[PDB]
């Protein structure tokens, strides 16, 4: 069955200081149920920039009996390989145009990156299960406008539950499929949001490198956002562009559905353990007012 | 590859051993230090719904003695039943299914369920299994207007399968393919399995069916041996060589034209899998290039 | 020493942790690399028959976090009951049992049963335990004609206890002794445990009883602290210091005259054992040399 | 739970060739009833002369799931340490006179040797349980004639069954105790016989260095003895003296009680595996006619 080395337990004791922190951990350690601990979204950047530390944190979670649902993008590497072979990434309305060749590259990267993370975990003794399809079902977002780029309509939970029941961290790509079986590129930030919607986990964490969201107006990191008060305002501010725009969109929608206790934490990997085990996060914390 | 003989492993190993010949045959495989892949194993989907426990037990045994097979399975009768439940009739032409987009939705859904059933079946026996549903087979369309979403395989990416085996987990593949662009295409599992054989050059190639081999429809008897250099051309021009047997016996001949003379594809019932691999049984239909 | 925190270990470790002080106390013992023996633990036989599950769980925890204690237990009330069943009355004189040959047969048989119960209780929680029924305590007769087969311990052979701990199994000792010539002699478990302390110089010395410490019979309150350099002589000349408490408090004073000032003997209820060892509880009666 | 390495299984396959050899192993591997596999008596000599190989064989049995009951003497080492300190071993009627000091040495040796075998096993990954008392109960053989030397009246099986149930080989000394708790020295060869009597195991094996019993008349090893025909005769032969005398006595008595299928095999360690797995022993095989 389950057992934990002295390092693992030392690291557990290093994360847990108060009584409610203790009870929180015990709640999810001993939980037998299909309401999970965490959805963690991993920026693709992180896998090629900081794999060891990403793999170590997740490894630690697994070693203390916590099975977060991991879903990663493949952002920069796709743009890299396109540019590498004399192709310039095409964009419009803040979303990538994906033809027969571009999806070929997106698929290739997703597989490469997903296997990199899975293997880094396995090497650290963590049972990791790649889940590259059969989770997201989508119809086209705007067939003519964006080509092979979808919009998630439902989430089949079964593969993920099967994975956790077997003692393996599910490691998901954000690729979707039409029912008919055309793979459609979907934004990792909204794909994680849809996982969060159905699994209603305790913790929703998005990992990026900047460790939050920066207010361009001041150049200071935004520590808290109270959507009820600030959503409409924040969307009008000129410094909010591109990927911070639709990220905040999904997170409002997501938190409109989820109860008042839930929140989304946008953080750096180095704060992950501290975010999961305690009620004091760093980075940008986004909750409903 | 982790060797770890559990109680049930030890009992299964010894159960039908009776002569020093059989003992010496097992020692051959256990004392070996070959970096060669042990087996490609094609599973009729029927076997997943009808004999999941037997299938899983036999694969468990191979896992536990550190002789990991690559497993490729089809979707069984379910697909047609599920379509029959909604009322859609299966159209085959020349032995291949007219897989339209509505039909594909059901094929996908069946593959995913069958695949996870077998994978969980193994996990429940403490056998690490890794479901590989995509990124292995890449295919062009076979004939868009004729068969619709059915593929002809062109390349095989070995990486996920290897990753799985190195990680200590049996790779369990569905036999779907995708175009480079990401459209899933249904592919004949007998062909799919053959392609894996072509690329992994394994010690044993095994096809599992419920009939327990290939039946000679004219004499009503199971065919034990097939020398393909001599028997192939006359065996093909027959009335009892079915829609699905044409493609199965064809791919096997093409595969053994590419593989060396030492190789051979056995077609057997699940219950005869252990004795087919380790003893040199006359069970099922054995097929080889021949003199 | 093997650290291996099972689920129940992790739950027991965290269950009463509430401040960073308690967390830091557990890190003290886990990050340590001391070659010092962790504990000698004396078990009233009553606890084996009455609270075996609690005893076993608490020892299981120490085992699983690799802080193995030496455990020395008595034979509880059973002996007297078993004698009372056959009709023989227990004779004590000055606080020690007149153990004749018939009585010894019962004492032996009880010790062996109690010892195996506790050992098996541990094994059933997946804790290796080794029953050590002889070859540890060697004794002269205390007073043949007075107490008959009762011993005064003279030497202790450490070897079996060390062998056990090195093999990864808790040593579970009965408190019998033998003459060099091999005659078994009944010995006071409080004294026996003290002798192990004397020879192993452990971090913690703990005596388990059901009462939960020593009760001050005049005020009806439990005594939390005893500074023996100051309090001993006046604490002895009292009406509520019983037959059995004289010898218990006496041996503890003699032992701490031999041990250094850092040492201390705690007397507590089984349920407070974990918090007594790792946190610095005020539960039970604590006894030390003092200023 | 239970698992076996590739070496262990290779060695199992090397011992098992025929179908009934296979069925025999499986019968005792899968436990079935309160039926023990083997009582093995180990000459004390073997523990100080050939420990590694003794430990390896027993280790192998344990690794294939067989739990023999091991009971060892302490023959030569006791005589050694007496002589080592200027004391000559006293003897009479073929049995050792054991006073306050001699028993002191016997006890010391039994503990030393019993821990040596137990540790040799533990070092090879075998769970071994020392069982030094509480098994044999004996009254004096002839108090005045031999002093502290007993005669076994009963065997308490519980410690041994407890050991096997816990997955640990019981490793017994041949020391007995009066009910009143005087330890009485008992002959390992007859002590094993009393274990054999109550446990009615499939295999009774006595290990010695010569690997059997030698007929002094010819100087040839005796391969078979049919007690019904030869007991009375063999006991009259002048070459049968000392420890072969009362060894053959117990084995006749033992086999009078046990059924016709049972036998005692007196062999060398190097033949142990072959003795236990097959119906063809070396050394001296003693059965009822």
Author numbering:
A (entry chain B), D (entry chain D): 63 to 351
B (entry chain A), C (entry chain C): 62 to 352
From the paper:
The first step of the route is the production of N-acetyl-L-glutamate (NAG), while the second is the phosphorylation of NAG by NAG kinase (NAGK). We report here structural and functional studies on the arginine-sensitive NAGK from Saccharomyces cerevisiae (yNAGK). The structure of the mature yNAGK, lacking the N-terminal mitochondrial targeting sequence (residues 1–57), reveals an unexpected novel tetrameric architecture, which can be described as a dimer of dimers with D2 symmetry. The AAK domains occupy the center of the molecule flanked by two pairs of interacting DUF619 domains.
A truncated form of yNAGK spanning from residue 58 to 356, corresponding to the AAK domain and lacking the C-terminal DUF619 domain, was produced as a soluble protein in milligram amounts in E. coli. Four crystal structures of truncated yNAGK, ligand-free or complexed with either NAG or NAG and arginine, were determined using for the initial phasing single anomalous diffraction (SAD) from a Se-Met derivative. Four subunits, organized as a dimer of dimers with D2 local symmetry, were found in the asymmetric unit of these crystals. In the structure of the truncated yNAGK without NAG (resolution 2.95 Å), the lid is observed in two different open conformations, which are, however, less open than in the structure of the NAG-free EcNAGK. Despite the different oligomerization of yNAGK in relation to other NAGKs, the AAK domain structure closely conforms to the canonic α3β8α4 sandwich NAGK subunit fold, with the N-lobe spanning residues 96–272 and the C-lobe residues 273–350. However, in yNAGK the N-terminal extension comprises two helices forming an angle of approximately 45°, and a 5-residue N-terminal extended coil. These three elements form a platform or “stand” which mediates and determines the interactions between the dimers across the Q axis of the tetramer (labeled “interdimeric junction”). At each interdimeric junction, a four-helix bundle is formed by both interacting “stands”, burying an approximate area of 910 Å2 per subunit. In any case, the interactions mediated by these stands result in the association of two yNAGK dimers into a relatively flat rectangular tetramer with approximate dimensions of 35 Å×109 Å×83 Å. This tetramer is perforated by a central hole of 18 Å diameter, which is formed between the two domain bodies and the two interdimeric junctions.
